[PDB]
């Protein structure tokens, strides 16, 4: 039946935004609800939540205006329609920083994180303690003798230093440096337990503290490891800044504990990214979805601009789009290629954040960037493609799966939420 056809669809379509609207809105509740899961990486999803949200709210209210000239002739449904076709260019943009967002978070290590609160020295320097240092944080002798101490740095340098030693120099002791930072845990009684039940990020900032302090140094903190490894972490927070560490150097401590607390690297991203990623998700649509509102209200208005079939009119909605999908691909095949490098070469477990944010992101580009690659340039059997409509409509739902309900930290808590309540 032609009739019956139409109206099936119709309600797998409403149904499916329906599903949408109420997970994105549960999920962005969640992700505000509990104090923890308040970072970058959640705050990135719940603009991407938006962007589905309010597309939800363009196909509620253009079904909700079919409700009492016609309704294609009006006003009220090209704002409608202009307004959904923001949503969809926020939706491609917004996963286009949940994917750079990914990217940069592959990037960044122990090595990134200590060439940020250790500097680099080009020439040797007698600092404050009456240490001898020189490239990142490479602490040499106590002994007040630069005679010495520049050929102590010739022994641990390989050729003669007069002083000045290279960029590269430099990253090969950095290098040195921090493997034997973690051989020095590895070879720690009360060192070893806490650090292989910590995560990658929180690994990082065990290894940070033993780079600054020392093996033996860190293995004092005996009533701060123990809570760590109970992952008991806002109670550690508290007592890390209890310490003698954390007066000596305010600014390194605060951002260690930082990501001790909350097991990200948010303690040292710059603010002004995020508010390059909010210019990009809400930004670069707006500045190809007006000018294309404005040619098809002067020079192509006809049933709220549906008939798209004249001229270039059409192209200036749909090549930007197609730049969001191509990059969007472009990052899905580099992701895959250092997740897979990473995991071989054990820096990475499939139980960290970067693995299963990768999860989720590598899936979502596939599943909302091949359509629009695959008819690139195709303007425009009849029952199969109408299944396109149902896919769009649980679009939102399946963001609401793989970015919430699914990940681990909220599932943390809900069940020490139900702990608090028992006890
Ligand atoms: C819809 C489905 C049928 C498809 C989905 C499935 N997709 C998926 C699963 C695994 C790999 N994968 C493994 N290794 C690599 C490699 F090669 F290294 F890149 C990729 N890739 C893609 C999925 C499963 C698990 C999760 C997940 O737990 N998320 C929560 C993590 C989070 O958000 O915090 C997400 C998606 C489930």
Known sequence: ??????????????????????????????????????????????????????????????????????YQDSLACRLVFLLM???????????????????????????????????????????????????????????PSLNAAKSELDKAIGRNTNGVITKDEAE????????????????NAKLKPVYDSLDAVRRAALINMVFQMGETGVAGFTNSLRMLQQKRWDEAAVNLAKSRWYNQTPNRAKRVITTFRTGTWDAYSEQWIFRLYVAIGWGVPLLFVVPWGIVKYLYEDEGCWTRNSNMNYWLIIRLPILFACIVNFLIFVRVICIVVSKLKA??????????????????????????????????????????????????????????CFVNNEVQLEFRKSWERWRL
């Open 346 to 403: 054990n820096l990475m477990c499939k139980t960290d954040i970067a693995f299963r944010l990768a999860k989720s992101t590598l899936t979502l580009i596939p599943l909302l960037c091949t359509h629009e690659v695959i008819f690139a340039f195709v303007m425009d059997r009849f029952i199969k493609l109408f299944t396109e409509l149902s896919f769009t409509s649980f679009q939102g739902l399946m963001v609401a799966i793989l970015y």
């Open 85 to 143: 076709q923001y949503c969809v260019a926020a939706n491609y943009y917004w996963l286009l920083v949940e994917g750079v967002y990914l990217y940069t978070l592959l990037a960044f290590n122990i090595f990134e994180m200590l060439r940020i609160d250790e500097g680099l020295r080009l020439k040797i320097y007698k600092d404050t303690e009456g240490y001898y240092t020189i490239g990142i944080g490479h602490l040499l002798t106590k002994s």
């Open 172 to 187: 090969k002791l950095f290098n040195q440096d921090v493997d034997a930072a973690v051989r020095g845990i590895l070879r």
């Open 1 to 70: 039946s032609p009739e019956e056809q139409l109206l099936f669809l119709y309600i797998i379509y409403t149904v499916g935004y329906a599903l949408s609207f109420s997970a994105l809105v549960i999920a962005s509740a969640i992700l505000l609800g509990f104090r923890h899961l308040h970072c970058t990486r959640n705050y990135i999803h719940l603009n991407l939540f938006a962007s589905f949200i309010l597309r939800a709210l363009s196909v509620f209210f253009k079904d909700a205006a079919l409700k009492w000239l016609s």
